Amino acid sequence: ANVVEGKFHVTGGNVTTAAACAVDAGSVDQTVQLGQVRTASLAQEGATSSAVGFNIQLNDCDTNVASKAAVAFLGTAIDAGHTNVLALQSSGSATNVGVQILDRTGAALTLDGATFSSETTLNNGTNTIPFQARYFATGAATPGAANADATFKVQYQ
């Protein structure tokens, strides 16, 4: 079967050395398995794969410093018409498919480093901000490796 298969590698941390929370060491460098998806499921612009979850955990939060956190992601957009779809790493790579990062509301986030996820209202101590990643077809996907990379920054308000 013709499939696209790959992983989403994400690294990141706080914008500022002096932040309301610490980013958990398990969250600052993660690799998310996107799975193997048949190109017949990605044969048309706007087709998407089943999303895979990944979390960003924040520790030791002090809500006297900030009551909310949000995350912005940076990565190469697959093309000017899909600024919320990551380009793939070129390594036998798939084409006409990229990777989207969704926040807890299901919105695919723009990948320009300035577009923040929906805000998470913090409790003191540990808080998790959930995300999902998935494949997004920009056309008739072709089989091959489909890895993507992005970086994130946590901002507080």
From Swiss-Prot:
Disulfide bonds join 21-61. Keywords: Disulfide bond, Fimbrium, Signal. One of its GO terms (biological process) is cell adhesion. Its main location: other. GO terms for cellular component: pilus. It is found in: Fimbrium. It comes from the Bacteria. Transmembrane segments: none annotated. GO terms for molecular function: identical protein binding. Fimbriae (also called pili), polar filaments radiating from the surface of the bacterium to a length of 0.5-1.5 micrometers and numbering 100-300 per cell, enable bacteria to colonize the epithelium of specific host organs. Belongs to the fimbrial protein family. This is Type-1 fimbrial protein, A chain. The chain holds residues 42 to 182 of 182 of the full protein.
